Amino acid sequence: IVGGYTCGANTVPYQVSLNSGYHFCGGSLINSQWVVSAAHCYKSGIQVRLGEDNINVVEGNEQFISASKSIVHPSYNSNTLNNDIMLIKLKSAASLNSRVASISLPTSCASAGTQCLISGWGNTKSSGTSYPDVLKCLKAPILSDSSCKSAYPGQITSNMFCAGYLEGGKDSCQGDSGGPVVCSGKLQGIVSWGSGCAQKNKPGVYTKVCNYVSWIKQTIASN
Numbered sequence: 001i002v003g004g005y006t007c008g009a010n011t012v013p014y015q016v017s018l019n020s021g022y023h024f025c026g027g028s029l030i031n032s033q034w035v036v037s038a039a040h041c042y043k044s045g046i047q048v049r050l051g052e053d054n055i056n057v058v059e060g061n062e063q064f065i066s067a068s069k070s071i072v073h074p075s076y077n078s079n080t081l082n083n084d085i086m087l088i089k090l091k092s093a094a095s096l097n098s099r100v101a102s103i104s105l106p107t108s109c110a111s112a113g114t115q116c117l118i119s120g121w122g123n124t125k126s127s128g129t130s131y132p133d134v135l136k137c138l139k140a141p142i143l144s145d146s147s148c149k150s151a152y153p154g155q156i157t158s159n160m161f162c163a164g165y166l167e168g169g170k171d172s173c174q175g176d177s178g179g180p181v182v183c184s185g186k187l188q189g190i191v192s193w194g195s196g197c198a199q200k201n202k203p204g205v206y207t208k209v210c211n212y213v214s215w216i217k218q219t220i221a222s223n
């Protein structure tokens with residue numbers, strides 16, 4: 001997260017870290033044993049880390065659970081990152097408490113101008129390389145589709161939305177992928193991609209979760 005702030009320990013209880021010897025992607029806990037993340041973060045043998053704040057120091061509050069199965073969306077396209085979403089079933093159900101809790105799926109899509117909270121352990125520099133120990137947060141609005149389409153000509157699908165600042169300065173970045181974009185208490189997006197980080201007229205692009213609620217529920221009810 002570039003231009004964000006320290007969230008505060010366990011203030012974003014649904015945020016999870018996807019670890020494979022190191023943090024590589026984020027994710028969101030939507031059920032005691034299901035987390036949603038980006039399809040492009042797919043890896044075999046993923047250990048999900050819940051109740052995490054400082055990813056580099058064991059603070060005793062966290063839970064480490066291996067992924068039982070990863071289900072990538074049937075129409076995921078690596079060439080365009082369209083349908084960049086995947087469900088991960090946990091090997092064991094998480095102990096939901098105050099420091100660990102699931103986030104609700106949306107009932108309708110969020111409009112442009114809606115303020116959301118984006119979080120993750122990704123790079124904090126536009127140019128440099130600096131990964132934070134503690135979780136970073138950022139408040140950013142959902143941008144209009146026209147603005148999104150003009151920033152990324154011919155690259156935006158109906159399953160993506162832009163969020164952030166058109167003048168740059170604040171944005172998600174490498175390492176935030178798969179992470180949550182929560183608006184008014186509902187998970188509306190998943191960190192997907194962008195051209196650089198925090199660049200003028202190059203806002204972050206996120207998977208539009210509201211288009212996959214039926215798929216998510218059905219997948220959970222049959223797996």
Ligand SMILES: *[C@]1(=O)[C]([C][C][C][N]C([N])=[N])[N]C(=O)[C]2[C][C][C]N2C(=O)[C]([N][C]=O)[C][N]C(=O)/[C]=[C]/[C]([C]C2=[C][C]=C([O])[C]=[C]2)[N]C(=O)[C]([C]C2=[C][C]=[C][C]=[C]2)[N]C1=O
Pocket residue numbers: 024025040122171172173174175176177178191192193194195196197198202203204205
């Ligand atoms: C995600 O954390 C990022 C989020 C970027 C948000 N940016 C923003 N809001 N402005 N997503 C990406 O990097 C996506 C997926 C792949 C292509 N993406 C892009 O945004 C690219 N855009 C234009 O070129 C730029 N991305 C990169 O170059 C990312 C490179 C690194 C290193 C790397 C890893 C695997 C490769 O095959 C090539 C290069 N990738 C990351 O940092 C990943 C996390 C990761 C994945 C696998 C192993 C290790 C780390 N970050 C994300 O996917």
